[PDB]
């Protein structure tokens, strides 16, 4: 005799493994939203609250790929997120507003 | 949110009948699409007669008003030999100009979709599920097998036999909030003027603001330049500028102070309108041809002009 | 390819009721009984709170619900 | 692998293959909506997003916000409906969380996420669970329950062809996932069917088993008759009016509406058992294998013969032995049985 089995059945071919790195930075978010120094403090409290809670229940695991610090895409996107619109200007010689 | 849910769930057959065959599915789909959508038919085609509109009841810019879209501003700087007659025809600079798109000679019907002309039965204080039942009953009570409303439903302006069962009557301040509504549906143009000259009212003939006309007439219209008759030249207007005051006519209308108000009627359209209900046509046609067809058919009729009326803002959703 | 499961429609019979109240009938057995007609619901009607809110305050309240 | 596309290579095996280079993602870039919002409205929209990411990761799920669908589908080269199954069964691991900067007005964090995507070979939707019922046999006095050992656990039927599946190494990530699925044939006594083993086991008399089915019928297996139901062979029973059978109430079922069926129809099968199956099952005191579906008369007999011969006559239970010989002889030679039974009671 028989009874229904409503759940699907999947036959495995293989498994693909991926590593994604997520980078968060409040200053980039505060600039686009035209925030004030009072609300910047709220943004900062709010983001730490959520991130810390996640940090507090997850132990570390070794993953057998190379160090991100050696990869171009990691170097290019970290320099951008920190120093994209930062410049240094040098006067021909020092002269102040008169 | 909806797409994310769609992206992890495969389909499953459930062994009941098709919703498309069930009354409650047909009635709640027609409602959610066409509840407050109506079609009005003129006795014969007749457009709004003038291109200039005197309407002092509305407060000028100096909350935002909808009629400010049609407000001619008085500018101090103009080009050389510039006249209103060149640009805004016979309109009085500092009042309102009605475009030729809202004054078409061949327009026979007006199609609108808004809940802002219902008589006192409708209240936003009440519950959605009440306000549904209330409308759903009224539309059943005011109809008989077709989608044509009974003359009782209309206001006394649009029909001799109207008793405001469904619709209220358009008032004097409605022009400020809902311009197109008035310009397309009013049977007669009524003026409201505190301009020195109208109805032969002379400054002597009067038998902070007090007894005074808002805008007095100057000698003539002129410009003057300094060897640069092209871009920047001073302009001298034919009337005064209301920028300083800007509340005069609005405060006058509400009667905070006495003033020489002028009002003149001009008949546009015959009081014999006919009004169809697109919610009642959806229910009736879906019993014969099935909802999938009727829905698609009536959704195209809302896009007859090229802009769909149901996606316009609620107060401005009136089309000829 | 276009998947669609018959996992809840495999047996080729169905026992239906005309009212939820009918489930308490004493001479029914232990099985699956379906209510015959679908329940149709508009969210606008269900969520009263949003109706009386305005601007982005209305938008953010719906986001939380969805 | 050097590219996600390389996972579809035909001469790969069943294992874990890692993409060689990390995927680097800035949230500012991902969340467009916030970019155009202002003040606290921007702040509250981000809060909702960060609180949802946290909720997914606690359940070991993937939040597909931070990865393009078009990109993944283009690379994997799958259909719209395959992608739905792939995204439902994928699982996440958080392998580090690091705060990179901390001012009173500014912060920055980094998160390491590791994903494992099962790529399907085949998906099976219309499935049935097997339930072995068996058959009772009354042999040389002993009541015995007999069962076939089927080489499958699931029957599948998508359209018209029925298929018999044997699963191995299975888990549950919402759906059932198996490493090994072998397609088999049902049991029979022929070259084109399976040659399955048959188990016997001794049971206590009287035996009664009644299972209420969901559609409103009853499954019955019983050592004795009641309400006209034959004994020893099982059957699916239905009644037109409520009545008491085997000391419980068999109710009339509620009228049903007919829909398209997907019920399997197994092939029929005759099965010859050894003459003394009841004595073989009794002297083991456990469930024991007695034949195969497709065994010869000669092999079947030369199987408990030596065992059975060595249950010989003894000085200490001659009467109890003689009574077994009679019960064994009754069907073969009824005249001899009646004699032996007499010399027993003397
Ligand atoms: C609760 O749920 C349970 C299920 O869990 C319900 O019980 C089930 O109820 C069903 C009714 O809906 C029963 O189905 C019916 O079975 C009848 C008997 O079938 C057998 O006999 C057939 C005829 O045999 C004689 O005559 C032929 C010549 O015509 C000779 O060759 C023979 O020698 C006999 O003399 C025979 O055709 C059947 O053979 C098929 O099944 C067996 C296995 O059981 C296979 O070995 C065969 O190969 C064959 O299957 C294949 O081929 C057939 C076509 O030939 C295909 O249909 C199959 O898919 C497969 O490929 C059996 O030996 C049928 O008479 C009866 O037929 C009705 O319906 C058909 C249309 O489908 C009409 O054409 C007929 O006119 C007739 O109306 C029907 O199929 C189930 O048996 C029963 N299940 C169980 C396990 O008991 C229960 O009712 C539910 N209760 C409630 C309250 O809801
Ligand atoms: C679109 O269509 C709507 C109609 O659905 C229309 O709204 C109506 O607008 C008119 C005109 O403003 C309103 O009528 C006026 O009401 C005035 C106030 O009414 C009170 O006072 C009267 C008594 O005076 C009472 O009976 C009444 O119960 C109220 O208490 C009223 O003063 C107006 O009456 C004057 O104007 C008419 C013009 O035809 C005239 O016939 C009268 O004799 C009267 O005298 C005139 O006074 C004016 C100055 O005030 C002067 O210029 C003129 O020379 C006088 N004429 C004479 C002969 O001496 C008038 O009745 C009406 O209430 C509105 N209806 C509703 C339902 O609100 C919109 O205005 C239209 N919109 C557009 C943009 O076209
Ligand atoms: C699976 O299916 C098989 C095949 O059907 C079943 O085994 C057979 O069972 C039947 C019924 O019990 C037996 O029938 C009898 O056959 C003999 C004649 O057998 C001789 O000739 C055969 C010709 O084909 C040959 O196959 C036989 O070979 C076997 O036996 C020899 C000797 O032991 C051995 O050396 C071989 O290796 C083979 O094993 C053999 O030479 C016949 O005399 C019988 O007649 C009686 O019955 C008929 C009909 O009622 C009646 O008219 C007569 O008067 C008489 O009473 C009978 O027909 C058949 O011998 C079996 N075959 C085999 C190969 O064993 C098996 O039971 C099924 N298994 C299960 C688990 O269900
Ligand atoms: C036990 O098995 C019986 C079969 O031997 C079942 O009897 C059948 O039950 C069905 C129930 O749907 C009956 O169908 C009804 O038919 C009558 C009219 O009868 C005539 O038309 C039918 C086809 O509709 C035809 O089969 C008959 O020969 C007649 O010509 C309708 O009024 C009903 O609405 C319904 O359609 C079958 O008629 C009936 N068949 C027989 C051979 O008696 C019985 O239900 C089963 N009992 C239990 C307890 O399950
Ligand atoms: C969306 O906008 C509309 C249009 O402004 C809002 O409707 C308005 O609501 C206010 C407050 O409830 C009403 O004002 C009050 O009306 C009552 C009754 O006349 C009066 O007693 C009070 O003194 C006050 O005037 C107002 O009537 C009403 N609109 C109009 C044109 O009359 C609506 O509340 C807004 N929806 C929201 C915030 O969800
Ligand atoms: C954050 O604040 C900045 C600074 O005000 C906002 O940028 C400004 O955005 C407005 C609206 O889009 C721009 O005004 C419009 O500019 C166009 C192009 O010149 C013009 O056609 C319109 O008539 C109107 O003037 C404005 O150009 C732009 N800022 C400046 C200084 O020009 C930004 O939108 C704010 N970010 C938010 C709300 O997320
Ligand atoms: C409403 O009607 C207009 C005018 O017919 C439609 O405008 C067309 O839209 C399609 C979109 O694929 C374009 O390819 C055409 O070029 C458009 N034509 C013009 C003249 O603009 C519009 O799509 C309709 N909208 C709806 C919602 O039905
Ligand atoms: C309006 O209708 C008239 C009469 O049918 C026709 O001559 C004219 O072309 C139409 N269009 C305009 C813009 O007048
Ligand atoms: C006075 O008003 C009447 C209204 O009929 C008008 O005909 C006449 O031209 C006006 N006269 C003057 C001098 O404004």
């Amino acid at each position: 005799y028989y009874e229904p089995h409503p759940e699907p059945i999947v036959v495995k071919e293989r498994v693909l493994g991926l590593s994604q790195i997520l980078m968060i930075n409040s200053e980039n978010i505060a600039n686009n939203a035209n925030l004030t120094q009072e609300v910047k403090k709220l943004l900062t409290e709010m983001v730490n609250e959520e991130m810390q809670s996640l940090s507090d229940v997850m132990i570390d695991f070794e993953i057998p790929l190379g160090d991100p610090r050696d990869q171009e895409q990691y170097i290019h996107r970290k320099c951008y997120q920190e120093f994209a619109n930062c410049y240094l200007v040098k006067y021909k010689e020092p002269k102040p507003w008169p | 949110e909806m797409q994310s849910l769609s992206d992890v769930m495969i389909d499953f057959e459930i062994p009941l009948g098709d919703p498309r065959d069930q009354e409650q599915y047909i009635h709640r789909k027609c409602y959610q699409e066409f509840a407050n959508c109506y079609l009005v038919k003129y006795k014969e085609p007749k457009p709004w007669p003038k291109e200039g509109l005197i309407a002092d009841q509305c407060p000028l810019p100096g909350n935002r008003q909808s009629i400010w879209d049609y407000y001619i501003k008085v500018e101090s700087i103009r080009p050389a030999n510039w006249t209103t007659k060149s640009k805004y025809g016979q309109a009085r600079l500092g009042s309102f100009y009605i475009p030729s798109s809202l004054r078409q000679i061949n327009v026979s019907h007006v199609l609108f979709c808004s809940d802002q002309l219902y008589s006192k039965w409708y209240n936003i204080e009440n519950t959605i599920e009440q306000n549904e039942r209330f409308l759903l009953n009224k539309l059943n009570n005011l109809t008989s097998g077709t989608s044509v409303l009974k003359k009782r439903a209309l206001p006394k302006d649009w029909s001799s036999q109207g008793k405001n069962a469904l619709f209220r009557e358009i008032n004097v301040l409605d022009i400020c909030s809902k311009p197109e509504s008035v310009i397309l549906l009013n049977t007669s143009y009524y003026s409201f003027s505190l301009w020195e000259g109208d109805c032969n009212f002379t400054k002597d003939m009067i038998s902070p603001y007090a007894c005074r006309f808002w805008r007095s007439k100057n000698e003539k219209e002129e410009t003057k330049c300094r060897d640069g008759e092209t871009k920047r030249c001073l302009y001298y207007p034919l009337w005064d500028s209301p920028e300083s005051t800007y509340d005069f006519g609005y405060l006058a209308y509400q009667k905070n102070f006495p003033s020489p108000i002028c009002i003149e009627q001009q008949k546009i359209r015959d009081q014999d309108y006919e009004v169809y209900s697109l919610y009642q046509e959806c229910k009736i046609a879906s019993k014969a041809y099935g909802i999938d067809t009727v829905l698609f058919s009536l959704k195209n009729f809302l896009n007859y002009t090229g802009t769909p009326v149901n996606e316009m803002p609620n107060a401005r959703a009136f089309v000829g | 390819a276009k998947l669609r499961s018959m996992g809840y429609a495999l047996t080729g019979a169905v026992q239906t009721l005309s009212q939820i109240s009918d489930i308490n009938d004493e001479n029914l057995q232990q099985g699956i009984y379906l209510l015959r007609d679908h329940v149709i619901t508009l969210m606008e009607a269900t969520l009263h709170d949003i109706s009386v809110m305005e601007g982005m305050f209305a938008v953010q309240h719906l986001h939380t619900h969805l | 692998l050097s590219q996600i596309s390389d996972i579809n290579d035909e001469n790969l095996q069943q294992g874990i293959y890692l993409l060689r280079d990390h995927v680097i993602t800035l949230m500012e870039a991902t969340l467009h909506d916030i970019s155009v919002m202002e003040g606290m409205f921007a702040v509250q929209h981000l809060h909702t997003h960060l609180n949802h990411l946290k909720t997914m990761l606690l359940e070991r799920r993937i939040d597909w916000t931070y990865m393009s669908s078009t990109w993944l589908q283009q690379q994997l080269q799958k259909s719209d409906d395959e992608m739905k199954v792939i995204k439902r069964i994928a699982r996440s691991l958080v392998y580090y969380v690091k705060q990179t900067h901390s001012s009173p007005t500014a912060t920055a964090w980094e998160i390491g996420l590791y994903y494992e995507l099962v790529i399907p070979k085949h998906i099976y939707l219309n499935n049935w669970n097997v339930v072995n019922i068996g058959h009772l046999v009354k042999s040389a006095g002993q009541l015995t329950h007999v069962t076939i050992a089927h080489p499958y656990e699931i029957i599948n039927k998508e359209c018209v062809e029925t298929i018999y599946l044997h699963l191995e190494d299975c888990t549950r990530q919402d759906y059932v996932i198996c490493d090994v699925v072998k397609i088999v044939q049902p049991c029979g006594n022929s070259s084109d069917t399976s040659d399955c083993p048959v188990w016997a086991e001794a049971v206590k008399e009287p035996f009664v088993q009644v299972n209420p089915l969901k559609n409103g019928s009853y499954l019955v297996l019983a050592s004795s008759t009641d309400c006209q139901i034959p004994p020893y062979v099982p059957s699916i029973v239905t009644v037109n009016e409520t009545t008491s059978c085997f000391g419980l109430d068999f109710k009339r079922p509620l009228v049903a509406e007919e829909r398209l069926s997907f019920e399997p129809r197994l092939p029929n099968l005759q099965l010859r058992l050894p003459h003394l199956v009841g004595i073989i099952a009794k002297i083991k005191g456990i469930k024991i294998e007695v034949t195969s579906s497709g065994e010869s008369i000669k092999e079947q007999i030369e199987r408990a013969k030596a065992e059975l011969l060595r249950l010989d006559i003894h000085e200490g239970d001659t009467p109890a032995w003689i009574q077994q010989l009679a019960a064994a002889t009754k069907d073969v030679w009824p005249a001899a049985a009646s004699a032996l039974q007499g010399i027993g009671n003397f």
Side-chain angles (χ1 to χ4, degrees), chain A residues 1-3 9 11-12 14-17 19-24 26 28 44 48 50 71 74 78, chain D residues 13-15 17 19 22-23 28 54 66 95 105 107 110-111 113 115 117 121-122 124 129 131 263:
Chain A
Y1 193 57
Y2 24 80
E3 297 168 339
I9 293 166
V11 194
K12 182 186 296 187
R14 263 181 270 291
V15 177
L16 176 58
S19 180
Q20 188 176 32
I21 295 164
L22 275 170
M23 288 165 45
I24 322 188
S26 67
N28 289 335
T44 301
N48 289 338
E50 283 293 334
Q71 189 171 306
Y74 181 89
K78 193 123 208 200
Chain D
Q13 294 160 295
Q14 174 168 121
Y17 303 94
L19 182 69
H22 301 274
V23 177
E28 65 209 65
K54 177 178 71 183
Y66 309 98
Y95 68 96
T105 40
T107 52
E110 253 180 52
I111 318 183
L113 298 174
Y115 306 143
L117 275 53
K121 184 179 161 227
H122 202 260
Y124 290 109
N129 281 298
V131 176
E263 186 216 0

Side-chain angles (χ1 to χ4, degrees), chain B residues 288-319:
Chain B
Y289 299 86
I291 193 164
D292 265 11
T293 302
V294 167
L295 203 46
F296 179 83
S297 170
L298 283 173
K299 269 188 168 191
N300 283 36
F301 192 92
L302 291 182
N303 193 39
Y304 198 94
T305 286
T307 301
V309 198
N310 61 283
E311 290 173 38
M312 295 188 197
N314 191 269
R316 308 294 299 281
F318 289 80
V319 176

Side-chain angles (χ1 to χ4, degrees), chain B residues 111-122:
Chain B
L111 166 62
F112 72 93
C113 209
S114 70
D115 71 333
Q116 276 182 34
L117 303 184
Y118 286 144
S119 49
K120 195 164 177 177
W121 72 263
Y122 190 84

Side-chain angles (χ1 to χ4, degrees), chain B residues 124, chain C residues 51-54:
Chain B
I124 64 163
Chain C
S51 320
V52 300
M53 301 189 213
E54 201 172 35

Side-chain angles (χ1 to χ4, degrees), chain B residues 119-217:
Chain B
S119 49
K120 195 164 177 177
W121 72 263
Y122 190 84
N123 197 342
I124 64 163
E125 186 271 313
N126 297 339
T127 321
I128 278 177
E129 275 276 43
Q130 296 172 19
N131 278 3
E132 181 163 2
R133 278 204 309 277
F134 284 130
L135 176 58
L136 295 186
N137 285 329
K138 282 203 163 293
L139 286 172
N140 260 309
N141 199 45
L142 284 159
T143 316
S144 62
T146 183
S147 59
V148 179
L149 289 183
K150 286 168 186 170
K151 297 299 184 201
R152 168 158 92 266
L154 309 187
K156 294 171 169 70
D157 184 37
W158 299 354
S159 196
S160 70
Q161 312 189 43
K163 295 167 201 164
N164 309 52
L166 193 64
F167 299 122
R168 73 185 176 75
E169 300 230 40
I170 292 173
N171 60 45
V172 178
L173 275 166
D174 275 320
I175 191 72
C176 314
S177 61
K178 301 179 293 299
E180 295 91 350
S181 180
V182 176
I183 286 152
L184 292 164
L185 289 163
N186 257 43
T187 59
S188 69
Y189 170 35
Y190 287 98
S191 192
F192 186 87
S193 185
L194 296 164
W195 292 55
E196 180 263 317
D198 294 321
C199 196
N200 318 358
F201 291 179
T202 55
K203 186 157 60 61
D204 64 82
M205 191 191 295
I206 307 179
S207 55
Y209 298 117
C211 287
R212 193 189 72 86
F213 293 90
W214 190 4
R215 272 167 271 196
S216 51
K217 196 175 180 72

Side-chain angles (χ1 to χ4, degrees), chain D residues 240-253:
Chain D
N240 81 327
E241 162 164 51
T242 296
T243 48
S244 192
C245 302
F246 302 103
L248 66 108
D249 275 30
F250 282 33
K251 301 179 174 169
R252 176 198 171 87

